[PDB]
């Protein structure tokens, strides 16, 4: 009865979360019509964490689909598992952000903030106890980056006690869909540090890297990334939705991970990823999950964790697993390479187990890791931002919408501030 309200923003946010609602409804047994057809009573024990009951046995998601253009709202609706969502929660604009952070934040997004804050307030009051708010968006766009983070700022003034899960993807250097992409990233991270309780960082160049060397997919389509992120979001809330030998809520993972308020950026890797050729040749055991989970290639951020020491770590295990075998693997990975673990935080890893694995898997795991190696990705965004800003490149689209250059310098002054506080724990 700990409810989570999901908010999706933009092209990236809607496409990620539409795949996310496909997985959690498949795990809970909701058909595309909306009824229930699961085999066990465990799917109805905690159905209310993501679904509001409706008349006739239909279950509707607690999802607030949000965009500044109407094209992507029809994209989620037209696809499978698209009729579950309430049409009242489909808040949309007409013009489009145009990859402009100022249009999302100040000029054009402000006409929709009062509209989306009403349906957030309607969904929070409907449920009994708020575990927190789940938001999925991008940082290189204009809708999920600009208009998304002001929703994060507004929802924290109204609800300063509940949690904030931001599955925000960060712009990458190698894959660069947008040329003002470092501009929208630095402005969004400035609004993300002072508002969000915890942030999970994903990069598309790492999701491509997972899809190439681990999954061995020849043509990774654009929805294959979102299913990897769907397994991420299904793993974080596994202890809320299901019983466990050792439960772990969103608040429990937050306190165990961040030692200080500003160190709230993590990187996530879904553990049992196997290629179809290698599926018959890999044996799933508790130690066999640990070697893939701590592998640097498995993590969905571009930052290599071998460069910086792990500050804290979190393990979310699902399946029939032995707790001695679960947690002795955590002391093996802390003793074998103690140079990659920080010293003044002893026993860095938080481990929790669930007895209900995902559909079709005997065993699964999900990793949340707070590390000082994540500063390397913010350096690349800060390096690109400082390159463009000194020439005042592309600024007339930004300064023409009411955003002065003073807050552009303040955003960079917070960018190296987060890098500096990361860096002084690497020594």
């Amino acid at each position: 009865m700990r409810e989570i309200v999901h908010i999706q923003g933009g092209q990236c946010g809607n496409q990620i979360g539409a795949k996310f609602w496909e997985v959690v409804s498949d795990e809970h047994g909701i058909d595309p019509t909306g009824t229930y057809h699961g085999d066990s009573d465990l799917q109805l024990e905690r159905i209310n964490v993501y679904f509001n009951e409706a008349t006739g046995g239909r279950y509707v998601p607690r999802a607030i689909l949000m965009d500044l253009e109407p094209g992507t709202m029809d994209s989620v609706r037209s696809g499978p598992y698209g009729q579950i969502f309430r049409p009242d929660n489909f808040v949309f604009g007409q013009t489009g952000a145009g990859n402009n952070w100022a249009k999302g934040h100040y000029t054009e997004g402000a006409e929709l903030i009062d509209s989306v804050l009403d349906v957030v307030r309607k969904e929070a009051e409907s449920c009994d106890c708020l575990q927190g708010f789940q938001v999925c968006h991008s940082l290189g766009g204009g809708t999920g980056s600009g208009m998304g983070t002001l929703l994060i700022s507004k929802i924290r003034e109204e609800y300063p006690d509940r949690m904030m899960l931001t599955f925000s993807v960060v712009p990458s250097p190698k894959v660069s869909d947008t040329v003002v992409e470092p501009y929208n990233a630095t402005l969004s991270v400035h609004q993300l540090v002072e508002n969000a309780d915890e942030c999970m960082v994903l990069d598309n160049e790492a999701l491509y890297d997972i899809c190439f060397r681990t999954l061995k997919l020849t043509t990774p389509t654009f929805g294959d990334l979102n299913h990897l992120i769907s397994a991420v979001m299904s793993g974080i809330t596994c202890c809320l939705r299901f019983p466990g030998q050792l439960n772990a809520d969103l608040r429990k993972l937050a306190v165990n991970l961040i030692p200080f308020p500003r160190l709230h950026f993590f990187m996530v890797g879904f553990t049992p990823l196997t290629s179809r050729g290698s599926q018959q040749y890999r044996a799933l055991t508790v130690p066999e999950l640990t070697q893939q989970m701590w592998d640097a290639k498995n993590m969905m951020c571009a930052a290599d964790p071998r460069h910086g020491r792990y500050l804290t770590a979190s393990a979310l295990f699902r399946g029939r697993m032995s707790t001695k075998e679960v947690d002795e693997q955590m002391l093996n990975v802390q003793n074998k390479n103690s140079s990659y673990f920080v010293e003044w935080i002893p026993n860095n890893v938080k481990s929790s187990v669930c007895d209900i694995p995902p559909k079709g898997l005997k065993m699964s795991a999900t990793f949340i890791g707070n590390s000082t190696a994540i500063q390397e990705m913010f350096k690349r965004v800060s390096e690109q931002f400082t390159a463009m800003f000194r020439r005042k490149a592309f600024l007339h689209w930004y300064t023409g919408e009411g955003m002065d250059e003073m807050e552009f310098t303040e955003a960079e002054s917070n960018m190296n501030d987060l890098v500096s506080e990361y860096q002084q724990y690497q020594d």
């Binding site: 030998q245 608040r251 429990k252 306190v255 947690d327 938080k350």
Partner: protein, 430 residues
């Protein structure tokens, strides 16, 4: 009559007690529905006609572990409103369990304790099951034990507190919570029985030859400790011991009330045909440092006082023969000011085996609960652990903002520090 009210705090309190109440129903023949198909009076209440309700409460701030008891096999056993649920978990936060969200649910907690203590004619003691590493076990367990001291004066309370381990732990903010809970159980708990998870992992690895033990395997033989210690109230024996006599024989000073636990015959079904369980054999096995349930070695310290709970076919003649052999052993020593340390209790009923369990059919058993100065080093393992944690102030913003002031971290620190000076001074040669 005689009765005990067993309160179970936190997730570890529920799961340990869920294996406990499995064992008590098989002990007295009570079916899971509660219908019997006079020794049951201590743990079970005879209600109406052919129905037994346990004298326990299951309180936890997280609803997901308490409804498992509601949905599970023992649904008809418990009173439905006797299992107290909460809106949201303490989430490993001592300040949340003690100040923020633990204050709202503890008002209902004392209400059912008043209802349970009124039902029993003569209340003998309180069994407190919690883990001080978590938010609910430490935070809510602190204020509940504090409120039990003012609501019931002089009434005995037993603390079976699962404690953080040196090598292995499931969380990061556990040394913060355990230090803060150490002050709470120092003055409130009358007899605190330490338990450590790595030692009970080690017992099942060699004695029960399971190379992958789980929490289900730990709590079944933790339940064997609670049943054996409380068997004297239920069943007749040669030398019965009550809770009131248990405290006066094992607690020499009011602030030294920490115990180590050992259960002697831990034998699988295959081994039991060849293993020999003499009275001297299990007494030798109980005092072996590998058989302890606390990750602690008694050779470093001195055994200040000891208790032996003999179950099954044990004559009072040969229990004293095993006592003399332990007292003449060079590796095991007592303190100089305690010439008679063993305080032995003998019961006439052999321990039962749970269906699907791993322990074998065993005639005679020993539950050794002893006070030692070696306990001072498990408090020093997290004295140094928490000091470097607090040295540059990690995870304090979580605890400061949830009601607790900064100075309460210091107050729990010299509580542990003056605790350390107390064991070395008491165990010192005089």
């Amino acid at each position: 009559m005689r009765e005990v009210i067993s309160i179970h705090i936190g997730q570890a309190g529920i799961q340990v007690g869920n294996a406990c109440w499995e064992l008590y129903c098989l002990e007295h023949g009570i079916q899971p529905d509660g219908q019997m198909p006079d020794a049951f009076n201590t743990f079970f209440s005879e209600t109406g006609a052919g129905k037994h309700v346990p004298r326990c409460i299951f309180l936890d701030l997280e609803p997901t572990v308490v409804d498992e008891v509601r949905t599970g096999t023992y649904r008809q056993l418990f009173h439905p409103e006797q299992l107290i649920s909460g809106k949201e978990d303490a989430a490993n936060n001592f300040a949340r369990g003690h100040y923020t969200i633990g204050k709202e649910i503890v008002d209902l907690a004392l209400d059912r304790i008043r209802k349970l203590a009124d039902n029993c004619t003569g209340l003998q003691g309180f069994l407190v099951f919690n883990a001080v590493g978590g938010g609910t076990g430490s935070g809510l367990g602190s204020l509940l034990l504090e409120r039990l001291s003012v609501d019931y004066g002089k009434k005995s309370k037993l603390g079976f507190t699962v404690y953080p381990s040196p090598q292995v732990s499931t969380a990061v903010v556990e040394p913060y919570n355990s230090v803060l809970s150490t002050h709470s159980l120092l003055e409130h708990t009358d007899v605190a029985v330490m338990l450590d998870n790595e030692a009970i992992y080690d017992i099942c690895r060699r004695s029960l030859d399971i190379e992958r033990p789980t929490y289900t395997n730990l709590n079944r033989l933790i339940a064997q400790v609670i049943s054996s210690l409380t068997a004297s109230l239920r069943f007749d024996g040669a030398l019965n011991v009550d809770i009131t006599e248990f405290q006066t024989n094992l607690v020499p000073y009011p602030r030294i009330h920490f115990m180590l636990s050992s259960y002697a015959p831990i034998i699988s079904a295959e081994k039991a045909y060849h293993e020999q369980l003499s009275v001297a054999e299990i007494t030798n096995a109980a005092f072996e440092p590998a058989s302890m349930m606390v990750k602690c070695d008694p050779r470093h310290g001195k055994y200040m006082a000891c208790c032996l709970m003999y179950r099954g076919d044990v004559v009072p003649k040969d229990v004293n023969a095993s006592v003399a052999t332990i007292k003449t052993k060079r590796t095991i020593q007592f303190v100089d000011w305690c010439p008679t340390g063993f305080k032995c209790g003998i019961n006439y009923q052999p321990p039962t085996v749970v269906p699907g369990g791993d322990l074998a059919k065993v005639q005679r058993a020993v539950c050794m609960i002893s006070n030692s100065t070696a306990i001072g080093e498990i408090f020093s393992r997290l004295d140094h652990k928490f000091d470097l944690m607090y040295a540059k102030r990690a995870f304090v913003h979580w605890y400061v903002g949830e009601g607790m002031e900064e100075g309460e971290f210091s107050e729990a620190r010299e509580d542990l520090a003056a605790l350390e000076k107390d064991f070395e001074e008491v165990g010192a040669e005089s």
